[PDB]
Ligand binder design. Structure first.
Ligand SMILES: CC(C)(C)[C@H]1Cc2cc(F)ccc2S(=O)(=O)N(C[C@@H](O)[C@H](Cc2ccccc2)NC(=O)O[C@H]2CCOC2)C1
Ligand SMILES: [Cl-]
Ligand SMILES: [Cl-]
Lengths: 99, 99
């Protein structure tokens, strides 16, 4: 698809069998999702945003479907205001910026 | 152009006669630039992100050149860690996400 930016680029994602709404975010290096349970072990990570650096849980090799496209990669879980799909997964679905 | 997302989508912009590096950010509703002087009146605004909120100065009807494309809109000025080109100006240069 071709997504214009007059409104937030929100899409449906599927993770752990659940449907959620997430923002396609080219300004985010990593994918960060609101609190949920994911399988396996997690590692600590700090992510810096507009208000500073914060603590999240890093889960690797997580299966996630984004707007019908299958991706498998790192998902960070923590107190984010919105679910964010970052560049680590946008590359997997072949997403580019065009003008 | 077509911009891939293996690295941060950083571009050169021209604002208030100065050249600056900025991030093309689909996850940002608004454009936020590091401390600088801009002409005209401003009003205070709070903007929220990962890590909480920052206080910025809102300048309206500001011209920016982004990749050679002229655009006009609201520019927020404040203690942002990176210069961000948000949706308000990405729409003006005809920027879309494609996959
Ligand atoms: C809340 C949301 C709607 C999404 C956004 C809120 C927002 C709204 C605006 F109008 C303007 C700016 C911002 S913002 O700037 O707050 N932001 C945009 C993100 O793309 C930031 C940009 C950025 C990049 C580097 C340093 C600071 C900021 N990335 C980010 O937090 O990456 C983190 C997140 C995961 O990867 C690293 C989050
Ligand atoms: Cl605007
Ligand atoms: Cl358009």
């Amino acid at each position: 698809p071709q997504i214009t930016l007059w409104k937030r680029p929100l899409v449906t994602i599927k993770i752990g069998g659940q449907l959620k709404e997430a923002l396609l975010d080219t300004g985010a290096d990593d994918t960060v999702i609101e609190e949920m349970s994911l399988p396996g072990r997690w590692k600590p990570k700090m992510i810096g945003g507009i208000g500073g650096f914060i603590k999240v849980r890093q889960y690797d090799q997580i299966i996630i479907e984004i707007c019908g496209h299958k991706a498998i990669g790192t998902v960070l879980v923590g107190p984010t205001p919105v679910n964010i799909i970052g560049r680590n997964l946008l590359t997997q679905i072949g997403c580019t910026l065009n003008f």
